[PDB]
Design an enzyme around this catalytic site. Sequence first.
Site, PDB file in Angstrom:
ATOM      1  N   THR A   1       0.836  -1.210   0.000  1.00 39.06           N
ATOM      2  CA  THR A   1       0.000   0.000   0.000  1.00 39.06           C
ATOM      3  C   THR A   1       0.871   1.261   0.000  1.00 39.06           C
ATOM      4  O   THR A   1       0.598   2.195  -0.766  1.00 39.06           O
ATOM      5  CB  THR A   1      -0.957  -0.012   1.197  1.00 39.06           C
ATOM      6  OG1 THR A   1      -1.744  -1.214   1.146  1.00 39.06           O
ATOM      7  CG2 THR A   1      -1.900   1.152   1.166  1.00 39.06           C
TER       8      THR A   1
ATOM      9  N   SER B   1      -6.125   1.127   0.276  1.00 45.52           N
ATOM     10  CA  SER B   1      -6.560  -0.065   0.987  1.00 45.52           C
ATOM     11  C   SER B   1      -8.047   0.119   1.311  1.00 45.52           C
ATOM     12  O   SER B   1      -8.398   0.803   2.289  1.00 45.52           O
ATOM     13  CB  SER B   1      -5.772  -0.277   2.282  1.00 45.52           C
ATOM     14  OG  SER B   1      -6.359  -1.441   2.882  1.00 45.52           O
TER      15      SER B   1
ATOM     16  N   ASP C   1      -7.272  -3.226  -5.543  1.00 42.15           N
ATOM     17  CA  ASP C   1      -7.072  -1.907  -4.993  1.00 42.15           C
ATOM     18  C   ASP C   1      -6.220  -1.056  -5.954  1.00 42.15           C
ATOM     19  O   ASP C   1      -5.338  -1.553  -6.661  1.00 42.15           O
ATOM     20  CB  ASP C   1      -6.377  -2.001  -3.640  1.00 42.15           C
ATOM     21  CG  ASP C   1      -7.219  -2.264  -2.402  1.00 42.15           C
ATOM     22  OD1 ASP C   1      -6.821  -3.047  -1.484  1.00 42.15           O
ATOM     23  OD2 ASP C   1      -8.288  -1.654  -2.229  1.00 42.15           O
TER      24      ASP C   1
ATOM     25  N   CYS D   1      -5.350   1.805  11.339  1.00 35.72           N
ATOM     26  CA  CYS D   1      -4.009   1.410  10.990  1.00 35.72           C
ATOM     27  C   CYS D   1      -3.014   1.720  12.093  1.00 35.72           C
ATOM     28  O   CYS D   1      -2.815   2.888  12.454  1.00 35.72           O
ATOM     29  CB  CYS D   1      -3.556   2.125   9.720  1.00 35.72           C
ATOM     30  SG  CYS D   1      -1.892   1.674   9.174  1.00 35.72           S
TER      31      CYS D   1
HETATM   32  C1  HEM Z   1      -0.266   4.773   3.167  1.00 30.35           C
HETATM   33  C2  HEM Z   1      -0.045   3.487   3.619  1.00 30.35           C
HETATM   34  C3  HEM Z   1      -1.059   2.749   4.403  1.00 30.35           C
HETATM   35  C4  HEM Z   1      -2.409   2.802   4.303  1.00 30.35           C
HETATM   36  C5  HEM Z   1      -3.265   3.640   3.429  1.00 30.35           C
HETATM   37  C6  HEM Z   1      -2.936   1.839   5.273  1.00 30.35           C
HETATM   38  C7  HEM Z   1      -4.268   1.571   5.497  1.00 30.35           C
HETATM   39  C8  HEM Z   1      -4.801   0.698   6.420  1.00 30.35           C
HETATM   40  C9  HEM Z   1      -6.206   0.415   6.575  1.00 30.35           C
HETATM   41  C10 HEM Z   1      -7.321   0.975   5.733  1.00 30.35           C
HETATM   42  C11 HEM Z   1      -6.316  -0.480   7.622  1.00 30.35           C
HETATM   43  C12 HEM Z   1      -7.547  -1.005   8.231  1.00 30.35           C
HETATM   44  C13 HEM Z   1      -7.865  -0.280   9.564  1.00 30.35           C
HETATM   45  C14 HEM Z   1      -9.242  -0.645  10.114  1.00 30.35           C
HETATM   46  O1  HEM Z   1      -9.411  -1.898  10.344  1.00 30.35           O
HETATM   47  O2  HEM Z   1     -10.092   0.223  10.288  1.00 30.35           O
HETATM   48  C15 HEM Z   1      -4.978  -0.743   8.074  1.00 30.35           C
HETATM   49  C16 HEM Z   1      -4.637  -1.648   9.080  1.00 30.35           C
HETATM   50  C17 HEM Z   1      -3.357  -2.020   9.421  1.00 30.35           C
HETATM   51  N1  HEM Z   1      -2.191  -1.523   8.875  1.00 30.35           N
HETATM   52 FE1  HEM Z   1      -2.047  -0.012   7.567  1.00 30.35          FE
HETATM   53  N2  HEM Z   1      -1.884   1.201   5.965  1.00 30.35           N
HETATM   54  C18 HEM Z   1      -0.740   1.773   5.463  1.00 30.35           C
HETATM   55  C19 HEM Z   1       0.523   1.482   5.893  1.00 30.35           C
HETATM   56  C20 HEM Z   1       0.854   0.598   6.916  1.00 30.35           C
HETATM   57  C21 HEM Z   1       2.238   0.261   7.316  1.00 30.35           C
HETATM   58  C22 HEM Z   1       3.463   0.930   6.819  1.00 30.35           C
HETATM   59  C23 HEM Z   1       2.128  -0.743   8.224  1.00 30.35           C
HETATM   60  C24 HEM Z   1       3.206  -1.389   9.017  1.00 30.35           C
HETATM   61  C25 HEM Z   1       4.333  -1.011   9.228  1.00 30.35           C
HETATM   62  C26 HEM Z   1       0.699  -1.003   8.395  1.00 30.35           C
HETATM   63  C27 HEM Z   1       0.187  -1.942   9.250  1.00 30.35           C
HETATM   64  C28 HEM Z   1      -1.174  -2.213   9.474  1.00 30.35           C
HETATM   65  C29 HEM Z   1      -1.695  -3.144  10.450  1.00 30.35           C
HETATM   66  C30 HEM Z   1      -0.842  -4.126  11.251  1.00 30.35           C
HETATM   67  C31 HEM Z   1      -3.030  -3.051  10.449  1.00 30.35           C
HETATM   68  C32 HEM Z   1      -4.044  -3.769  11.272  1.00 30.35           C
HETATM   69  C33 HEM Z   1      -4.484  -2.948  12.487  1.00 30.35           C
HETATM   70  C34 HEM Z   1      -5.473  -3.629  13.388  1.00 30.35           C
HETATM   71  O3  HEM Z   1      -6.369  -4.354  12.871  1.00 30.35           O
HETATM   72  O4  HEM Z   1      -5.407  -3.434  14.633  1.00 30.35           O
HETATM   73  N3  HEM Z   1      -0.049  -0.182   7.586  1.00 30.35           N
HETATM   74  N4  HEM Z   1      -4.048  -0.026   7.333  1.00 30.35           N
END
Ligand code: HEM
Length: 399
Positions: free
Chosen positions: A239, A282, A389, A348
């Site tokens: 992403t 995402s 996506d 996130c």
């Molecule tokens: C611009 C980049 C990114 C976008 C747009 C993005 C977007 C998202 C979205 C839409 C979710 C779902 C949140 C929800 O359940 O409401 C999410 C969850 C998550 N993201 Fe990101 N993400 C990005 C980058 C990252 C990076 C760099 C990491 C790790 C280093 C990461 C790790 C995670 C994790 C582990 C979850 C799960 C959180 C949970 O369910 O507690 N994301 N992200």
Amino acid sequence: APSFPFSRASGPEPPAEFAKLRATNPVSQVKLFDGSLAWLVTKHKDVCFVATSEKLSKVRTRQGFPELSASGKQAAKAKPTFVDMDPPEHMHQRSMVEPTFTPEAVKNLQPYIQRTVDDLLEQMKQKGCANGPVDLVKEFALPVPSYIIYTLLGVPFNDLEYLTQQNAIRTNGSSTAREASAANQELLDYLAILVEQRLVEPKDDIISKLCTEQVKPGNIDKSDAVQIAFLLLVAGNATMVNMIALGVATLAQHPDQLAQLKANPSLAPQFVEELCRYHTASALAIKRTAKEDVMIGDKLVRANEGIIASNQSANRDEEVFENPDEFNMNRKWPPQDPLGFGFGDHRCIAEHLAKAELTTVFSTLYQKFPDLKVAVPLGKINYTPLNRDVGIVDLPVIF
Ligand code: HEM
């Protein structure tokens, strides 16, 4: 009920279905690949409700969970990590790894993020483009997030290039199923060795903290540490790559806003805010099953029915974001949050890190390369396949 997921209307556009649904059918049923149904939620207010309601569950062993592909159904058999947990398991595990990602921790990481970006830009400069364009994805958008998350996890520097390539194979559209699965298991095997090593001699990294704070006391096992580390790697990296590439493309699409960003790199935060709203890379993660009946708008979602809440559609909701289909880095933001990073307790973990990476990129790239140009016509950009996506596979540039 129409089949879901929907295909994007064109390379850089959302599915056309969502605007129509917001206008006339904001909570409606869609048909998944298996013939099951699910409720699709399209308005910002309702997406926030889905994301926060305690009557809804992320547990994938609940019948009704809206798996969108055969591979997702397979994946739901494994022992879950916190992404697929409800309270209290969710925060019990997520809190194990939160510290690196807090606002303050990310502010203190800024010099490191800047140095990483700077170094990768200087390599470009040294490689040059005298013999023609180079791929901004391979040279920059891919290694920036990859090097950062691997480094934070605990990968040593000389292994970054190879492991960056292998993680890209997991998701590259051109990989065969065998190649993608082999890369997945290769990375897991690698992380298992790093856990063994950091259990014996911890260092300054996330795996070491899992080992010392959670594995050694018996709170989790080594295999759990591997899977948490792996989740942190794979959840966001592709992403991030897409968001960088899409940002460069978007600036080229809208020359006056690029001119504004060159003239004033302090606009990078608001550019990134608009990017994360407009390009919701995402869009399929806010999924639930109802544990009991829940009313959403004019619909009743019954116990054991699935729900998909489109944060992409929420981010184009005209009731919240005026002129939502305009990319405007000088947007007058409303009180309601954009939902590029989701909402509620599962929002996130890396939102602050990701925004810092993006802000660093967009405050630096055009200072380094003020004449950076996409080297093909914009209408010829190679976007991800339309049934996925939004993203960009490769992006030829000169500078
Ligand atoms: C611009 C980049 C990114 C976008 C747009 C993005 C977007 C998202 C979205 C839409 C979710 C779902 C949140 C929800 O359940 O409401 C999410 C969850 C998550 N993201 Fe990101 N993400 C990005 C980058 C990252 C990076 C760099 C990491 C790790 C280093 C990461 C790790 C995670 C994790 C582990 C979850 C799960 C959180 C949970 O369910 O507690 N994301 N992200």
